[model samples]
Target: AQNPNCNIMIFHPTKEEFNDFDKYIAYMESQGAHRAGLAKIIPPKEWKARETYDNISEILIATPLQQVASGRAGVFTQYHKKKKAMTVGEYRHLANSKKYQTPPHQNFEDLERKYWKNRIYNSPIYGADISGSLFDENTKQWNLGHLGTIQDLLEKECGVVIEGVNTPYLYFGMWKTTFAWHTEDMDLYSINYLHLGEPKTWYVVPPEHGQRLERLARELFPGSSRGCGAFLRHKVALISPTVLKENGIPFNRITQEAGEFMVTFPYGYHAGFNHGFNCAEAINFATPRWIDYGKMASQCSCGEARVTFSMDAFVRILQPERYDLWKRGQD
Candidate 1:
């Protein structure tokens, strides 16, 4: 029962608004959270292009950011070797032992090991930011901090709805605390609008590519993909870094809610990063849902709805016939 698609403006405080953190949080309360769209539009021709969801995808290259190496790997390597030592049972004992500080047998190595590990992984590298196409490592941490501030203000003031606040499963493939890429159980749709920032570089590719890409990933970085699949987006086929102008009517000339580029078909596949340029930022919330292939176009033209074939979806589509097919494949 989702609407086809709708637009909502991003809320921001004026200069007159309070400058203090508490005051800023209060100001957000005075404004409001945005209600973006859910349903997507079909371009018609895309219908014919539907072969199997995995067969087709679009790549969106939005804003791209420069990567900085701040010698964090030294710390990273140190902790990686240390975490290998602590077992779950030992970790528990360490927590319980905290109450009895006088105990001589206590092993503080475990706690020390874990603490530095988090710092090495979570803290930004090079402390940089990208502005107007310039990359400055000194401001990496600054940029991330700004993003954190924005996220915090929304949660505190506008009561902006976080999709998985109550759900035990996380909507995003990776946690804000985790830097590695992972896949999520559910497909996702997100929206965001920020006053200042640069565009991002987005990569979009079809499904099943995940399996292959993951294989390549593991071959490149052994053991990186284990037990961490739940936090990633599985099928991102199309990506684009959309530009937006600062306007009260979030919709651009194209009628997209945020004047930013829009894409539907939740699981169609898409992921992006800030181009590390421009002072503007884009923000949005996404839902975890399967993309409906009923709305795709064969070649972004002719207005045909493309039908994507998932082996699973195909089985559902052709249940009885699938029995013979499944048996044949096995044979």
Candidate 2:
């Protein structure tokens, strides 16, 4: 279902229009989650990425943690140490224990300087649960306030039980906070909204070439034949667009600005970097077509299982419709 003509489409919708669940679903369906696209929504007048950075820095700095020096805060100070990343929850639990001393952060400004220099990247942390959105250090309570409209639409329109794998994760990124090339879990669709940020550069490979690209990656970086090991280890194989083109691989590029939504379709291999500092919220959803993809991807063990939705639930929803189509057999 990936559109060949345009891989990364762009749109601008009014706040009121986005608030309407039906209209939102209709628009998304027309564009199809079969490709990555951007939706431009005007943000509040006072909205700024710096304010978000400041708020997060305040919360983390004020909290006390016993494992401050040992890298126990789940914060990835990657500039100092590569292959190191931690969850905010780890940092919070240590803080709540009142056992460890807080790390030396002279001020928010100092913390900000350290974060970008350290290349801190915290992604898709627990933003919500069955009880509603949980409050955390990186993902404050109201981070997803505006984008909650899309969340409601996915649940109401698609009958997607929004728990377990469907929960949205908050991403706090700085300069060089990079995501390597990969597809959505089981080729499921996902949406990312930049609540506020400088900009994010994205490169997407079409679904048709996803498998080929994976093979190429393995050839370029041996010993990663099982999964995306090269990318995880920061050994980016095919980063240059022109280089990829010369090798017969097609790709698309786009820079997502503040108040924009980027949707990645099933099987699209996308990778990108934060231009500077930014915050984004992302969540996954399933449509009727996704049921088949889930069934197929669930059988393979290429990487970590991202099939969070119940297959039985998906089957129950699709079986009857497919049977009806068979009975008609008019095509």
Candidate 3:
């Protein structure tokens, strides 16, 4: 269980209010969502974002699943490459069933869910970039490319396509599939929308405690963290709430239902799993303030490594004429 005092704010907004991203996020920031590191938004009763799933069901991809057991992140979907790619319907059938081709792990069934488990808890399909895909083109409101506030300065300013960084990616999940604990690349803000299906559970830590989470990870997993500052980018550490709770860290648990949106604050660490079959889309976005964080990650005063983004390209767009003159040096 999370600390009872650390609850995330949930806002019930009409479609128009949410579409007005600048005003809405400005209010959300005033209401202090940025401190909590995560917030939830529920759409009005008339909205129907789930119908887009019909357009998604037949799409094919490499079969996906990974051991739900706690360990380093593996290339789960990549491991299944020799087999033919399957559709969402076909994949869901096998995933919903009690049996599937289990990953080759000894004593997989013997581990506990909180500790370790022989996870038939099929791994979900994530990191599927779908910005230009027809599904994204047809989906209204839930489209990442079309968001207000947190975007604009990226593509409209920089004019470059950075795939999932600027573009949106779709995710599919079943049972207890897990996305390990991590902050966004370059510690930028991100939004994830559950377009359809069962609820997904999320656990988030406050931005103030971001460094503490990294400190704990280094203590627990030194092989990757002992000499590294960018361990979060490695995607290796997956600590259970039990560790966090016992360690006295402040955190919150959020159940994201269908037709809802979750926006994570910059540098706020979050990770979670799905309750059942679900489809969602997510992407990273930036505010002008984010460039400071971007600059921090790019600094070399310390040899510590960090996930770096296109600061050079991004800054050029902010002042193209000035950047051109600076690039050529003072006369």
Candidate 4:
């Protein structure tokens, strides 16, 4: 676990899961890796609350922007800076930041949508909205599948430890987006599910690939590009039946019972597609963490994307929220 040499780990439960991987590889071999596509199955219970409003959650969580005072700035500011290096302005001020206050004659939604759609393509930020049945008290059971299906395989097949799932806290809205790229950071593991709409996922070429893709992305899809050497991007791929076919993986239409997921290539440089569009995905993400009972969980910090809230702060904010959702003594 301490070693950083490992880059990719594929987990398959039983021989059947191996068959899925084998078929995926076969498609990669025949149709090319680009054609190997699979739907992402992101479980619920992974999404966490954001400490600061940052605009998105302001309305979704019903917390007004004005309600967020500067007093809570310390922990929040440090959160995004440490994770994505994103500034507060970078998180909120989109091309149409003033759309809300604009004149009535203006088409704010259209303007905002046009700007974000392109901005996401040209800008360095990536985003997605995530929600699933797990959030609902009545929908906790397997909507389409069970975690054991993948968990058992990840551990039994790949020596890699299967940690908990983590997604965003957008309440499964119409569309959810979160900006992220590949990182060897702490050797995390992730699985993103395409719930709705066609999201474009761009991959940076691994250092082993000679930075060719990196240069190409820099020239073509710079907005989606991360960097070169450790990553690369050549041709951007969409997340539909057609592009999935192009990647050798089929777009398995996932319902509550049937779902799709794509395992991330750590430190390979990649990000999500079509952020802000009115499409939603129930993304299930996870990372490696040590369960040291002696270590203070509050002292622990998640080294990932956060606008203005530490996971600790998020837990505190969610405490009251969950108090009502969770039962008193027993479930």
Candidate 4 similarity to native, TM-score: 0.33
Model 4 lowest lDDT segment of ten: 73-82
Q: In candidate 3, what are the lDDT values of residues 203-253, reduced to their tens digit?
A: 899987878887777777776665455556545457766678877777887
Q: Pick the candidate with the highest lDDT.
A: 3
Which is better, 2 or 4, measured by lDDT?
2
Every candidate's lDDT? 0.25, 0.47, 0.61, 0.29
Candidate with the greatest TM-score versus the true structure: 3
Q: Count the backbone clashes (under 3 Å) in each candidate.
A: 79, 4, 4, 43
Off by over 4 Å in 3: 1-6, 50-52, 63-84, 100-142, 148-165, 298-331
Residues 213-262, model 4: lDDT tens digits: 33432443334334322222111222222332343421222122112345
Q: How would you encode candidate 2's per-residue C-alpha lDDT over 214-275 as one tens digit per residue?
A: 66666554554555342322323324454466567667877777766677766777876564
Ranking by TM-score: 3, 2, 4, 1
The alpha-carbon lDDT assigned to residue 287 of candidate 4 equals: 22
Clashing pairs in 3: 108-118, 109-118, 111-116, 112-116
lDDT at 177, model 2:
49
User: Once model 4 is optimally superposed onto the true structure by TM-score, how far is the C-alpha of residue 257 displaced, in angstroms?
Assistant: 20
Error of 3 at 198 (Å): 1.8
* C-alpha-based local distance difference test score of model 4: 0.29
